[PDB]
Amino acid sequence: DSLSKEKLLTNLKLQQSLLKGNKVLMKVFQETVINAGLPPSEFWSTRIPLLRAFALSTSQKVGPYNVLSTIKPVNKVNVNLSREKILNIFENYPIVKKAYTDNVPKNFKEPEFWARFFSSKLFRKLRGEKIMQNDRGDVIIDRYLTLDQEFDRKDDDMLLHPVKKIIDLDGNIQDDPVVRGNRPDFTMQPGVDINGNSDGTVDILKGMNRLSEKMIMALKNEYNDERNELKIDDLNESYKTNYAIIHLKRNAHEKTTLKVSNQQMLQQLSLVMDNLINKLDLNQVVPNNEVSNKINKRVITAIKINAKQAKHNLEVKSTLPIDLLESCRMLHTTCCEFLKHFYIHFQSGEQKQASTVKKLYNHLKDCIEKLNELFQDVLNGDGESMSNTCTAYLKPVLNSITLATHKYDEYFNEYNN
């Protein structure tokens, strides 16, 4: 289905679809392929989960439901039609879909059609309403009555299937074919009208049963056992988890990249217990104001250093021209995209990746030179008034990029040379 990497890369229409959904994706994609000419497959190669998420979001569909039962008759009536529910009616009733498609594009209007439909007795029949000759219906819609009837016959023919003997009430009533007793009660048998005909409640009940069967066979779509069926689980062994416990052997390496004696510590301990019981003065704790002044110097130095650390506690406010700010952000973004794709190629590790690595190396070099030329532009646009800040802002991505270039050169010298 539409789930492989090849399928997701193939769906150019879906790619354009979420392209048109976003705006920074036009920005990024335009710079990536319209401006830089990157292979758009490798563009989308990162965004594969996003593509699949968009596809699966677009791909779901609802389950069937009794749309005619949700239809209410609502003096006068005003049509308040919902197109999704109109298509729901179409899907649930292909007869109604057909009656739409041979009359509205031929004879009259859609709201006129639906007014005729709500007027029609075919609507009442298809809904849970007993038909009545007092009702006149709509003649145009009610011409489809026998067509819907033969649809019902064909659908019932489809719905017929053999039954399991474990639950077969037909086999149950065919237990004794020579039962000769008495005629059962009118109460508990299906009653009829005065002239022997039925009222049709059996028809409406078999119709709603047909609706249920159509439901469940819509569920039963494309998208022996009695031994298991008759198991009595209540007298069986309880399930126990096979979860594995874990122990932990403990032997850690010592930290890598004079010794005191009991006599000497005991001597000092005796002496300091003697000093402890001897004396203790709070007043002697006051310092000499000179070594204390050096303490003041050290403390104040630490305060100054950490205060300058705290002095640099939406992005930050900047005094850039907004266009050059956007241009440099754009350049940073496409350089980051290039760098990530180059790392993807490099960490992949194949000889098939070699030309890709070389070409992305060329692109990184081009980005470097374009960064330098941008620095020349902000040079002769500022006189290095705040072109220094431009260079420093674009610095760390450039450092990482050129570090990657050095890594590529080093591995080239490692393998080839």
Binding site: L280, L282, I295, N306, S355, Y411, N416
Partner: protein, 292 residues
Amino acid sequence: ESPSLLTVIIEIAPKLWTTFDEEGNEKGSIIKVLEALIVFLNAHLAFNSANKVAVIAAYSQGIKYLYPESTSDLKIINSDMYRRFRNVDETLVEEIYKLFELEKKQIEQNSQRSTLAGAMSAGLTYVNRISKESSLKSRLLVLTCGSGSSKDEIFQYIPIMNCIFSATKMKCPIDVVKIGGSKESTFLQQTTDATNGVYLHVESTEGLIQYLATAMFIDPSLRPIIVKPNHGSVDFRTSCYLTGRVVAVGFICSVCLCVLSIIPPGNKCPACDSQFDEHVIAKLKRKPVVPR
């Protein structure tokens, strides 16, 4: 604003104190520290009228609830001083002498484990107790003698992390005072940085009064309007399990989650015995493929 529940843990150990005073010459430096802390608690309980103080000492064999007295009479200090200050100081010097007499009594047995993490945990439980009673600021103070032999912080690491997480839940900064030869204590520095605590290491026992009076006075009533004075920064990295060196980029077990700077021998976990996948580790060992 509110009474700041003061939490002070003093790591007392003759193995450290003897080492420090033999390395230097300031005998009674621990006494100087105790007097300085006496003035510190005086300054704190004079800063606020109810900012109650929890004082606990961890000796070599365990810990002790110093302040206050247990739930179950000489005066060295002066009679002219304040009533509450005098009561607390007399109680603490009595408790300190009792603990030191006890330490002299049972000196000759050996326990090589530091009790700092357990003392910190018990103090945090008491912080929960006090805060649950009756709104109180939580601020934890540790005093250590770092001149002793850095034996093994490895078993201390895990409960220290747990204490960090708990104090993070409890909004309690962990402020560290170190006196020792070693300038750096990485786990304590990480503890201060994560808990928004204060790290400080010096050597001289003199001037600690000015040191921890000036710097070590930040209360949660005024924490955001005070810059922290710490200068060190920590990478929050750990040494490897089988080579004992810190790693920047490496490997961890999918089960035990211990850092592996290299491939374990036998491709099995050195912590929880999980045998791994040879193709996985070969892909990890893969060199990049470069054109000729």
